[PDB]
Amino acid sequence: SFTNATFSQVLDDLSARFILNLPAEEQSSVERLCFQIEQAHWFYEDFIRAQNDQLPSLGLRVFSAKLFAHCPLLWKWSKVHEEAFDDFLRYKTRIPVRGAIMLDMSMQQCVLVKGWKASSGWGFPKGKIDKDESDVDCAIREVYEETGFDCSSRINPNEFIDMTIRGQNVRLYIIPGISLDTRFESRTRKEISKIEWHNLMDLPTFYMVIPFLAPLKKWIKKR
Amino acid sequence: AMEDENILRNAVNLQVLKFHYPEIESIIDIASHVAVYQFDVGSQKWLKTSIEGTFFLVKDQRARVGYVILNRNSPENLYLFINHPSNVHLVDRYLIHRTENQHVVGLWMFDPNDMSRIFNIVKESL
């Protein structure tokens, strides 16, 4: 219970909880440490700043700087934190992202998800790949993560759309025949606020979906 | 340098453990990551509780041996005592702890070496 706990005691906890006792397999790189910093940030924002309202809401870059200047293991990177954090999100924006374009039985509507913050736009249920898991297992993991629907018995590994937006490789598997009565709900702590169907004709030929609209329409007209 | 990191590591660890449970005295051993489960009798199925975190085999100021998991998914930590080592079982890839009041908790340790070492410590500690 952090009901009243100083920001130093918080950073002490977050050190022992997410950083200092990690398995050695991912404590070797700097970026791998920063991914656990992002986990410790979500804990601080969602949980620690909910038992003690006096603690300030910090951005991920600001929170990382405070924790790097705090945890003794991370003192080496505290001076070059801005450059090391730049290398972190430079690393993160290159991880392959897999998802699924779930079409309905009429192939005229698809499933899109909206981010937590109201400013965030719509997009297909997709997420970054984990260590050693396959592209299909990743698409199943994140579609189930963001829509609560299991598409393992429906995903077709040979039917996908491969895209390389900026440095981020994105692969979305086309899964038609998803009934409109199927129930959707996200199984994350944030990240997803809404899940609805959208008419493909009502999409702009805001959304990060446009890149996939050219290949998807050609794929549907074939069937 | 390796021993220096272990000194700072155990210092911050112990201070955080005392922050949550001041009765804790020292840390006997640590497992990197442990997922906790609970076996539902009557339902005859295992329930996966979202208690995932670092595992701290600790000892309190009253010489009671227990373990603390700093849950990474919620502030709800897990502190459980081991009153007799015949309540922990090494079965398959998991440890099965039958708490004193007929509760069955299943600990999956990410590191198999941490599983065997923690299990052997408990079997020798009493």
Binding site: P23, E25, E26, F35, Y91, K92, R94, I95, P96, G127, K128, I129, D130, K131, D132, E133 | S32, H33, A35, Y37, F39, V41, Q44, K45, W46, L47, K48, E52, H89, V91, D92, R93, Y94, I96, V104, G106, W108, F110
Partner: peptide, 23 residues
């Protein structure tokens, strides 16, 4: 090549845990 989720995050499913006779 690059990943966002470690291995320990993929804890085995609840069905994987053993069911000894005494359970």
């Amino acid at each position: 090549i690059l990943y966002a989720g470690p291995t320990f995050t993929h804890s085995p499913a609840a069905s994987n845990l053993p069911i000894p006779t005494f359970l």
